[PDB]
Symmetry: D2
């Protein structure tokens, strides 16, 4: 049939841009988010979503933009956990319930961020989330093989989107994190 | 004029061995854990605990031992989150509320684990927790300067033995005594990371 | 005008595959190696080459592939230094003398390899070289901005039983195809927001 | 009966400080370098040196590099720095290993620049990256001989020395790189 893509968080930002570049006559591109009635942080909602989608080829997760900023000593832990619930656990749930529907040659592309490795004050929540995502990405790449699992690590929306396509298209890549940060890590 | 230590999870395992070694004519060593009525995953408890301790010199967190093993697709997420609450958020809470009482020249030493970097099937909860601790360790180190913050990353082999508690404890003592070290992660894994 | 590519080591292997994919009617693809009279380990030979080419857009270095296998205690140091001279110092010489000729929006893409981080007995020369390449990539990326500098880090790429032995252990289930690796170069070349990065394409070998 | 230490680069700086801390009634501490006539970048010279030492327990290598942009630095100078620090370490490990007693170790020196990206420092960065990668292969090949690296920043010499001592004393540590950079890696 057609190659089916699922872009969670793909209603806006990078997600939307990627969805646009994926739209063709030979593909089906599902996008979902809080806007479309998917709470990626809620397991039953995530399970529901993938039940309505069925078998597809490539899963992309970009959801999770908010996080409380400030020093560890100041930042409210409840807000921090709420940040974790969406960007980290959201990805975990997505992989957990999406995986069984991936067709042969399928892939999962998660999203971390440079803050996983660039040490910046005020950003422990984002750094912790991203570091966890990158560790989980590699365990998944191992457990789910031959299903490929990679992460894009952002620092133009089209240049970021290009990295996802590359993850989706390269059949020899798995368990890797691709930095697209315009040299912020330097 | 004694140097004061707090070891969270210092009632057993690495913490207990480290607490013994820290005991001396010039030190006071407070140990706390579930056994002593401290729930490190609860902010109220942790906030109150440090209230009773007052100003001290070195904080060491070794607590949070359990995590549900298994594939990502199999592991119950609530259990995963619960493990996160204790080891990771426990360390965050300890640092968040412990930092205020640290005397000048003091330090915080956290515990991660080799699984943060050694990719092993069925260990995504520990891998994620440890990776998170190490990233947070470095942020803390930057924000708390001149207070030093480091992490010890224990392993279970090239060395031909399994790690003794005193070998791990030695790493903590090194972090505590070396005042030119902050924001580092000290591996003591018997070479397991070499795979 | 036409976009100009220089692929050092592009007369065979990964480089040859990449040169074929870059080949088109609106591009100019220069390939060179020992076969074409370029000794990338010899500074005056590298200087000569870029004088003949002049201004161009993208430099890709895949040159140098041999290194003595074995333990540190056994490997003849003189052979190690020779391998270093080609793959590492060759890349340094290519960037040093090629840089001034890169047009606006140009880039440099070097080649390391998984052995920079996958710890494998008997491979210290390759590991050392690749670790050196990747550290140098990032310093370059910083000194040459806005010229972009990145590095591709391939795993095993396509006796028959050795391939079967590998495939079985690789998460992807197959051994690298030359074009799988070349795709990564094309991505580094086309992505104007990527610099200072190392791109792993190793079929999951780094996972252990 | 005593424990024997060899510190290449031990006549000054970190090496000298470490040698001071290792000296005691129950140890023997050999120090060597250019100052004592040892040329660590010369294979024959390193080989012969260990002949004079014989069996021992712990080798420590703490043994300049041209600063400048990659486009500016003279490559023969860059190669000369590599000869002394990287290949010097390789030669020390290569010819000193067979002499190491049971429970012995090798501790090399890299530096934060292997991982802190700084303009004008490509030679040091490349050297320290090479060291840290070679360190881990060695730790794997030489097991159960332990092999670690100390990575200093641009600090107090005794604090750096403490890191070496820690590497030497911990029997459960091999293939690791210990940062004692005073927070410089944090940026």
């Amino acid at each position: 049939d057609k190659t089916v893509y699922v872009v969670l968080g793909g209603t806006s930002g990078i997600g939307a841009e990627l969805a646009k570049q994926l739209e063709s006559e030979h593909t089906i591109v599902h996008v979902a988010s809080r806007q479309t009635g998917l709470d990626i942080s809620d397991e039953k909602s995530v399970y529901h979503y993938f039940e309505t989608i069925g078998a597809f080829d490539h899963l992309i997760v970009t959801a999770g933009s908010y996080a409380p900023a400030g020093k560890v000593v100041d930042v409210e832990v409840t807000q921090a956990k709420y940040a974790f619930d969406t960007k980290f656990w959201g990805a975990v749930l997505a992989a957990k319930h999406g995986a069984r529907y991936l067709k042969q040659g399928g892939s999962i592309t998660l999203t971390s961020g440079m803050l996983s490795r660039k040490v910046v004050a005020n950003t422990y929540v984002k750094a912790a989330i991203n570091a966890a995502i990158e560790a989980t990405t590699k365990v998944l790449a191992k457990e789910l093989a031959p299903i490929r699992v990679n992460a894009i690590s952002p620092g133009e929306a089209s240049d970021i989107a290009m990295a996802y396509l590359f993850a989706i298209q390269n059949s020899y890549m798995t368990g890797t994190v691709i930095d697209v940060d315009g040299g912020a890590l330097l």
